[PDB]
Design a protein around this ligand. Structure first.
Ligand SMILES: Nc1nc2c(ncn2[C@H]2C[C@H](O)[C@@H](COP(=O)(O)OP(=O)(O)OP(=O)(O)O)O2)c(=O)[nH]1
Length: 174
């Protein structure tokens, strides 16, 4: 559906034109809080939908995006996915596209990004490996023998290094 260029230009527009309403007050939202994730990050020729990870330093402000969310001069629709995932649709220039958005906290920054960074297969492999190491990775933190422990990283590299693994390129899978 979307191409590398399309994704780049639409995301750029999307991020600089996003605004949500909280308590009747309009709060504009840029890429400062939202990071484009998908094949776009993997540097792919063509992808289906553009996904956007919205990382907020406050649980409140994060949930404040839900009451009202809009775009400047654009056609959209609001859908939900699972328990923490969200799905939106956007149309412009007589064209229609799919926009997936996930709500995450500033602490769930490295984890979320690592997840959308390359292929799910790699993640599953890591999750299974940690399971053998008696560790459990989750969107909220790392579980050491049922004991939840927070993260001391912010980078994917730092995350893999902290987890005890190596970082490979998603472009060539795993
Ligand atoms: N597609 C999708 N992605 C999710 C989900 N949960 C985590 N992710 C992971 C799976 C993929 O490895 C990675 C990329 O997800 P995206 O939703 O951003 O879409 P992307 O553009 O990468 O794939 P696409 O071109 O939209 O089909 O994110 C999910 O339930 N569905």
């Amino acid at each position: 559906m979307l191409t590398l260029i399309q994704g780049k230009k639409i995301v750029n527009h999307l991020r600089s034109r996003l605004a949500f309403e909280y308590n009747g007050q309009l709060i504009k939202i840029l890429s400062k809080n939202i990071v484009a994730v998908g094949s776009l990050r993997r540097e792919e020729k063509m992808l289906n939908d553009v996904d956007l990870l919205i990382i907020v330093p406050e649980k409140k402000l994060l949930k404040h995006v839900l009451p009202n969310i809009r775009i400047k001069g654009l056609s959209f629709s609001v859908k939900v996915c699972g328990e923490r995932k969200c799905v939106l649709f956007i149309e412009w220039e007589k064209k229609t596209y799919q926009l997936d958005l996930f709500t995450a906290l500033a602490e769930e920054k490295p984890y979320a990004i690592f997840h959308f960074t390359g292929p799910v297969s790699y993640l599953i492999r890591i999750r299974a490996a940690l399971k053998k190491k008696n560790y459990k990775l989750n969107q909220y933190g790392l579980f050491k023998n049922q004991t939840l422990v927070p993260l001391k990283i912010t980078t994917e590299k730092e995350l893999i290094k902290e987890l005890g693994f190596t970082y490979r390129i998603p472009k060539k899978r795993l």
